[PDB]
Structures are given as structure tokens and as C-alpha cells.
Symmetry: C3
Subunit: 334 residues, 3 copies
């Protein structure tokens, strides 16, 4: 076709774990969906100890925002690298076909911008990330990754082909960081990205992250920033990991319907306790809350969750169901 | 309903890898199934070198026993923490809905007990484990985990919906331990759990287990404690890993039908060589033995199996089938 | 039956990533397929730095060659261990049933040979590897592994049961090496395999590979040895990892149909970005190229890919499709 005859819609992205407004079932024909992201290199405090890294971000956040389109829409991304940044960046969409996912076409020095268009031909949730030749893992593990959801035009379907509709959606980006350590086990500090590079590579080559966090920091999805729901609500949690395997688990719940490797033409796995999202993948889990209270949402390597950071909370409001669970005899000395 | 109108059945658990008597197809309506477990903190020798750890157990074993119920039964667990123990414990069932899987309702100091009830609303094999706030991975990686199987009321079914009936069942719990090491690489020893805690955390944060074992120790499922079967028998092996990924493989056999992430509403994967059970999950594999002899059942990271401990044996009796395999020319010099 | 009444066919194997000529749909009844492999212990340079290891190979290559048969063919392997080698070797086929996959029947000292026959009763791609009692992971992680493909007699089928036919096939064997390091982080060197053994075990027990490579070396599948295809061609990539999990990804493409755990009686997963092949498994991915240019095929732990070696290239020829992807505004300063 002539792409110029298609409707265009502009989307202003929002900060994770929230997701820009969209419709599950497409209310228009195929569209060109316009997004803009501005790269920001910035200092970020990643843990309760105050460890501060030089993060590389799309749009100021770790992860980058979730983009949402429908199958056979076109994604048109304006990517801006302001002259206040120091490094070369680009973008690779796992949703796209050709040119290293767009990375070969989007190399931007500080002070430059570019616009890429691609057709979103496959439905699912997909990773996107920076990937500059020769320095790929350093950019990705400095936070330069996010996800895109390409919904089927008729929305999500269960294992029998009936509709699944979510009431709320959240995006959890999980980030493995590799802060260099000295012989004593202390975090080392660096004056410029160039001076950091070799020790960053050495730290990555240990294959042992120092931190594994949701939404950019230890505890980011707790307290006043806990996720929320009500009993009876249907929630979709999109979860990505651009570099390393993870295994999400909702403590006190389940994944009712899970696309662990994130691709919606496949039937979901039912009734999961824990699911494996391979590094370089996004997955999606759908759950209907049945009990109120605090839930922990974790990577179920519990060391990764509770010592390294990969844990957040839901706060769920509503009625307690004593048929589903009850204390028969509360803890006591007999 | 009124739960008080339902039948009650008490189950005395048995030590892994054996499993308490049960029926695959439910011969009664929904029931309240009563279990009791007594927590035991004890010294355990985990390897041939005589390395001794302070283990934390449900019912005296690593793993804890396998509980077996049917879908929409109620599980009523009396959990006892005798005053001979030192630590606070609780229990989180991945099978249950609400209150952190029961963990928020079951916190017991030494000298206390509690009774929890939950409805087993989802069929599958599931992990259970201790999870005291602030110290979760330490308890789990000290051995405080097991599994529960919630059978469909009409038993297991193949990928076409026809019945699969097992003749024997075994439960293999795989445990990653993190014994702290000094600069020389020697295992460190500790006088109290409190004095152990920080070094236990440091050792866990390496993400590198020192030992990975079946049934609590290197070689536990070998020799006089090898698993057994006969040619033609259908065997279900339930396998759990509460904290870390594993990849079971029967050396010389297959998983004919595998629920790698353990949930029986999904069709099984057929003809598997090796399957991935994510950390925080239980899985189940069904196989019909076709040849006699010794089999090794391993985690197929072969370093994990043969150097760190994650290997056991089957001893299978019966007829050799020369059509399936034969030596044509035995090893010789020509 | 009488196996002596069946047709015999001899196959001369070829070096990975290429695959010996075969037919997808079986043009004969069941056959005895005769293969010969000669073990070669040899020095191999594995990285750009010139690190040289003592490799243990089937047929001179890492990985060993891909064998291809059809379901219910018999595989008859003549395994030769020349007297120029030093070690004991054998072979375990994950495709086979009994005797530790053949390992109990194929133990050959230098100067010996043996012939094994087995019936290939399950369709799929499977690992084979050396497995001498007491020294299994050392042989496997020194390169002594490959794969066998057992095709359904009516070829591959999609998720709806319609035929999938590949135009080209490649075999990517991914190898984790554990070169021992000293306190400084330098690779240690050894005079005999016996003198190497304990430090090889210590290095393996770190669970941290020093190198992770395709086809035996960093960069082996690049440059003049890049994989090739044309736009519109259907390509099957068989990928094995005998010891450790991997997560393949075609940068700029997808897995249109993926058997991540490699067994063809199961429906494929569709539209994958990245898939998890557990250690001890072979998997297979089918893709139809839609854009020309350079693609990177990687393990999507990007540290493993770009720092440790697990990356190769496709060079694809043909027409660029501007509907699928285009640069709208090339990188520039505004
Ligand atoms: O960018 N990682 O959440
Ligand atoms: O039950 N999750 O720890
Ligand atoms: O929070 N990780 O050290
Ligand atoms: O729970 N009251 O014993
Ligand atoms: O408790 N782990 O087998
Ligand atoms: O074939 N298992 O090592
Ligand atoms: O048995 N593990 O050192
Ligand atoms: O196997 N007898 O040569
Ligand atoms: O033998 N490994 O590619
Ligand atoms: O998109 N692969 O890096
Ligand atoms: O190429 N690996 O160090
Ligand atoms: O791409 N030309 O602005
Ligand atoms: Cu970047
Ligand atoms: Cu990528
Ligand atoms: Cu405990
Ligand atoms: Cu848990
Ligand atoms: Cu060998
Ligand atoms: Cu094997």
C-alpha cells in the first residue's frame, strides 16, 4: 500500500510500570503509530546503600517505556540523542524485521536524531534495546532496554480461543547490573564512561550481577509505589529481561494465563506458579485477584529477589474469602 | 458450602523419595485432607567429604515430604515448631491463594504451633517452602522446602485427553546449598545461626552453589537407596527446585510425557530428552521403562550433576531388548 | 523383525555447520543408517587472543557432526579411538533407549573400536556426547558433543499439521569452555591431561565459563564462514548445548516455528523472539528470511554473545522491503 494513506496517531509515553492508554481490540484499521523517545544518560541510585551508577536510558527511566500497537500497524519512532549526552546510541526492536531490528539504521551521536519506521507483523510482547556495534552488553546492562506490545487486532484469547480482557496492565522491566568490584568486594567508582569500560566488561564477564532490580532500583515497586488492584480485577503483567533469564512468581497468587515467551499466536500456559522468561525476551501473565492484602511479585531465584533486588509488591483491596484460605488455629503455645 | 459437612481424612507423610498412599482418580467427593509437619533444625552431612551444615527441615528430611490431594480438596496443615528449635518458621504453599501462600498466617516461634486451611483450586505439582520475612532465601536454601501434588479429580491425561496412569511415583527434591568459603576456598564453620547469617548471605550472593543434591546429600539416591522399576512399568517422577533452575534428564531414557512447569490443565510435552524446571517450580515427568539396567537421573548441567551432586540412579529389572539397542561389535583392537 | 532384511545406507558426515545430504520426507522404508566417527584429541585455538586448549572431538570438529535419520530407522555407529589418542571415550545418544544411551556399551581405549546399533524410536533433535564414568563433564566441556536429528517419516509439520519444508539447514553447536585461571585471572597451561584434571574440575565448579562459542571458536561463524541465505528461503537452524542453558535469537529476525526443546511430535512455538534450549538439549528453529543484509545469530545473554563468544552471522542476499522497515529520516543534526 501507500503508507501515506493510513491514519497517524501520536502517543505520549508514560513512565513504567504504567502504560500509555490504548484499546485491546483495535477500533481503527491499521495505523502509523508515532512515538518519540529522548535518550538520557544520568546518575541513578540503585540500592538502599546509595550505590550510584551512570545509567543509560530511553526517556529517563529504567526500563524504557512500554509501547503498545496492534498487529500490522506501523511503528514510527523518532529517537533523539541530545548533545548533553556523551555516547553513541541506537535501537533494536525484537518486534521488527531487518537491519538488526533497526539498529543498523538508527545510530545517533550526541546532537543527532533519527526516525525509523517498521511494520509490526507479529503479535506478542517484545524487547527493544540499544545495541551499538562493539558495545552492546554495556548499553543494555546500563538500563537501555524496554518493551513493545503488539496486540492481536481482536485482543487476547485464551487456550480455547475465547476473549481475555484485562482491566489493568503493568510493565515490570527487570534489570541486571554489574557494578565493578575490587579484590575486597567493594564497588569501584569511575570518572568517565571511557575509564569505566574495561572494568565494566570484566564485571559483566563474571556473569554474576551485583544487583537485579525492578523499575530501576531496589524497592522501586514498594511502599507508595506498590502496584495495586482490587479483588476481582483482571491484571496483565508484562515482564521483560533483555539480557538474563528470570522466573516471575506472584507470592500468594498464580499466572492464570501465561505467555512465558510472550507471543500471542500461541495458546497460554494455564495455572502457572512460576514461569521462565529467557534473557532477551518479554513475557506476559494474566491473573484475576481472588484475595486482598499484600502480595510480593518476585524473580523466584529468591536470592535474586530478596538479596539482589528483584522483588516488588501489590496491595490488593477487597473482601477476604475464608473458603479459599483461613487460619484455623492462630500461632500459639499449647 | 459448610466445610464442616465434608469428609476428613488424615495422612501420615512419608520420607522422600517415597510418597504417601493415594488414589489417582478420586474415589470420594471433595475432602478436608489433614496433614501434620514438625519442623526440625538439625545437622546434616551433605557430601562424601563430611561437610556438615545446619539444615532446616519440614519433618526431618530435605526435601520436605510430598503431599498429595485432589483438585478442590481442602488442605489443612498443622505446623509444629518444637521448643528444641531456635528459629522462627512458617510455610508458603504455591498451590494456595492469599496471604503470601499462607506465610502471613503461619509464623511460629519455637514452642508454638498453628493450623492453616486452604482450598487447592488448581491442579498441578507445586512448591511449598518456609518464607519468614527478611530471611526467606536463607531458610529455603537451608533445605526448608518440599512440594504438593494436586491431582485432577479424574487423574492425569495425555495430549489427546486419554488417561495416563502411573504404577509408581517418586519425588526428587533438588537442593542448592551455599556453604560459605574463605579466601582459600575452604568451607567456613559457624557456632550459632546468628553468627552464620551474614556469611550465609554473602555466599548466597555469589549465585554459585557449593552443592546441588537430590534428597539432601551427594549420593542419596544411589546404592541401596537407588530408585527402582521394572521393564514395562509407568513411573511418574515429581521434581522440585524452590530456588534455582534445573534441567532433569533420565540417562538412557526420556520423559514420555512432561509437565515441565508442572500444571496439569496443560497438555504435556512429548518425548523430551531434557526439560527445564524453573526455580520456584515443581514439574512432573512420566516414563515407561523399556530396558533394564542402571540409569542415571541427573540435572543436565553435568557439572552440577557429577561434580556438585545432582545425580541419582534407577536400577531397572527385566528383559533386554536387542531390537532397541545392541552392541554389534564389542570394544576391541582390530 | 529381522534387521538383516532391512536396507543399509552409509553416510559420510560433514563438518558443522553444514549437514550431510538427506531427504526430509522418507523415500524408503525403515533402514539401518551406518555412520563412522573417529575420535581426535587435538589442540584448538578458541579465541582471538590465541588461547589454546586440548580439545576432545568426534570427527575432528567442535561440535561433532549432525547425524540425520528418520523415525524408526536404526542407527549403526562405528566409533574409532585411534592409538594416537590418550584417553578413554564412549558415546551416549539422547535419542537412544538403554545402557546409558549407549555409553555402557561403547567404552573404547586408544587403539580400539566398537559398533553400536540403536532404534531411533522418537522424532526430534537430540544431543549426543561422550560420557566416560567418573569424568563426564570434563569430556563434554572439552568439546565432545554433537547432535542427531530424527525426522518424522513424513517430514516436519506446523501447529495446524500442514507440512513445513526447509530449503537449507544449519547446525550450530554451542560450547561452554572452562579454561582454568589463576589468582590473577590469567589462563593456566598444562602439560598432560592428567596434570590438567583437578584444575579443570575446579574451573568447572565455578559454573562460570571462560568462553562460550559457536562451531568451536570465537568468530567461527563470521566473515568467510558466515551462514548464508537468500530472501524468501526457509532455513532450519538446529542448535545444541550439551551442558548449559542457552537462549538463541536471530537479530533482525525471529523463530517462525520453534521446537525449543527439540521434539517434533509437539506443536512448534510461533513467532518467537528468543527461545530457551536447556543444557542437555537440542532445539530447532525455522525461519523464512524477508530482508537482506547481515544478521547476528546469538545467545541472548548478550555478555555470553559479545564478550564470551556466542555470536555468529548470516549474510542474506536479495531485495530490501521498505514496507517492512525503512529509515524515514536518516541520523542527522537538526
Ligand atoms: O531496563 N530494565 O528494566
Ligand atoms: O512463594 N514465593 O516465595
Ligand atoms: O541490591 N543488590 O546488591
Ligand atoms: O485461632 N484461634 O485459636
Ligand atoms: O529441599 N530440597 O530438596
Ligand atoms: O546422557 N546424559 O548424560
Ligand atoms: O558436592 N558438592 O561440592
Ligand atoms: O562383539 N563381538 O565382536
Ligand atoms: O560441541 N559444542 O558445539
Ligand atoms: O536484538 N538482539 O540483540
Ligand atoms: O571469548 N571468551 O573469553
Ligand atoms: O533521510 N533523509 O533525511
Ligand atoms: Cu545506548
Ligand atoms: Cu536483542
Ligand atoms: Cu524456616
Ligand atoms: Cu515461593
Ligand atoms: Cu571422551
Ligand atoms: Cu546426556
Amino acid at each position: 500500500v501507500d503508507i501515506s494513506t493510513l491514519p497517524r496517531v501520536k502517543v505520549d509515553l508514560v513512565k513504567p510500570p504504567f502504560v500509555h492508554a490504548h484499546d485491546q481490540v483495535a477500533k481503527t484499521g491499521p495505523r502509523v503509530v508515532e512515538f518519540t523517545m529522548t535518550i538520557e544518560e544520568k546518575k541513578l541510585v540503585i540500592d538502599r546503600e546509595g550505590t550510584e551508577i551512570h545509567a543509560m536510558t530511553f526517556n529517563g527511566s529504567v526500563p524504557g517505556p512500554l509501547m503498545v500497537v496492534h498487529e500490522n500497524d506501523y511503528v514510527e519512532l523518532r529517537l533523539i540523542n541530545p548533545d548533553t549526552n556523551t555516547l553513541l546510541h541506537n535501537i533494536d526492536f525484537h518486534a521488527a524485521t531487518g537491519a538488526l531490528g533497526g539498529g543498523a539504521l538508527t545510530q545517533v551521536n550526541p546532537g543527532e536524531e533519527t526516525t525509523l519506521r517498521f511494520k509490526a507483523t507479529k503479535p506478542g510482547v517484545f524487547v527493544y534495546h540499544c545495541a551499538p556495534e562493539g558495545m552492546v552488553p554495556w548499553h543494555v546492562t546500563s538500563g537501555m532496554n524496554g518493551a513493545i506490545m503488539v496486540l492481536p487486532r481482536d485482543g487476547l484469547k485464551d487456550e480455547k480461543g475465547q476473549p481475555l480482557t484485562y482491566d489493568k496492565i503493568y510493565y515490570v522491566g527487570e534489570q541486571d547490573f554489574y557494578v565493578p568490584k575490587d579484590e575486597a568486594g567493594n564497588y569501584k567508582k569511575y570518572e568517565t564512561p571511557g575509564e569505566a569500560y574495561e572494568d565494566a566488561v570484566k564485571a559483566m564477564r563474571t556473569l554474576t550481577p551485583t544487583h537485579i532490580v525492578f523499575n530501576g532500583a531496589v524497592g522501586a515497586l514498594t511502599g507508595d509505589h506498590a502496584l495495586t488492584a482490587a479483588v476481582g480485577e483482571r491484571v496483565l503483567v508484562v515482564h521483560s529481561q533483555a539480557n538474563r533469564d528470570t522466573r516471575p512468581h506472584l507470592i500468594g497468587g498464580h499466572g492464570d494465563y501465561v505467555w512465558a515467551t510472550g507471543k500471542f499466536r500461541n495458546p497460554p500456559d494455564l495455572d502457572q506458579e512460576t514461569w521462565l522468561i529467557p534473557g532477551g525476551t518479554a513475557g506476559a501473565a494474566f491473573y484475576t485477584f481472588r484475595q486482598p492484602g499484600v502480595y510480593a511479585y518476585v524473580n523466584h531465584n529468591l536470592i535474586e529477589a530478596f538479596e539482589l533486588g528483584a522483588a516488588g509488591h501489590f496491595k490488593v483491596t477487597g473482601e477476604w474469602n475464608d473458603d479459599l484460605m483461613t487460619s484455623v488455629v492462630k500461632p500459639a503455645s499449647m
